[PDB]
């Protein structure tokens, strides 16, 4: 599939947001480096949401198409609504 033309939505779905936040929160809880600055946050979920708001989550969403191909979107490339 041509990465120059990705047909899927440029928005992050609610399910993508949910799973990305959960995954990154688990990664933080397992002592992964944090990409944003931290005032006093110790809850991995809060840190993951701060990273998502900052657009600094190092995860790629591989969206599968019904035909079998896939499209890779960086979390910073998608439009975060909520």
């Amino acid at each position: 599939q041509a990465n120059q033309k990705r047909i899927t939505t440029p928005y992050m779905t609610k399910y993508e947001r949910a799973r990305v936040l959960g995954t990154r929160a688990l990664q933080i809880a397992m002592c992964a480096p944090v990409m944003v600055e931290l005032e006093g946050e110790t809850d991995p979920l809060l840190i993951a949401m701060k990273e998502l708001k900052a657009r600094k989550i190092p995860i790629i969403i591989r969206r599968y198409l019904p035909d079998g191909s896939y499209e890779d979107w960086g979390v910073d490339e998608l439009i975060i609504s909520d």
Partner: protein, 51 residues
């Protein structure tokens, strides 16, 4: 398709005008029986040692 699960609780429900819509008032015995496995980090090492 359906099965019994751990980390579940059940009791009678009761009104509480002083909870927000997204809150649930839980007894201390249900909460003392049920547990959440929290991973240790330097961010929470002290609090989890306290617990």
């Amino acid at each position: 398709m359906g099965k019994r699960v751990d980390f579940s609780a059940r009791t009678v429900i009761t009104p509480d005008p002083n909870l927000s819509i997204d809150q649930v008032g839980v007894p201390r015995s249900i909460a003392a029986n049920m547990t959440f496995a929290e991973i240790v980090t330097p961010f929470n090492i002290d609090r989890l040692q306290e617990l």
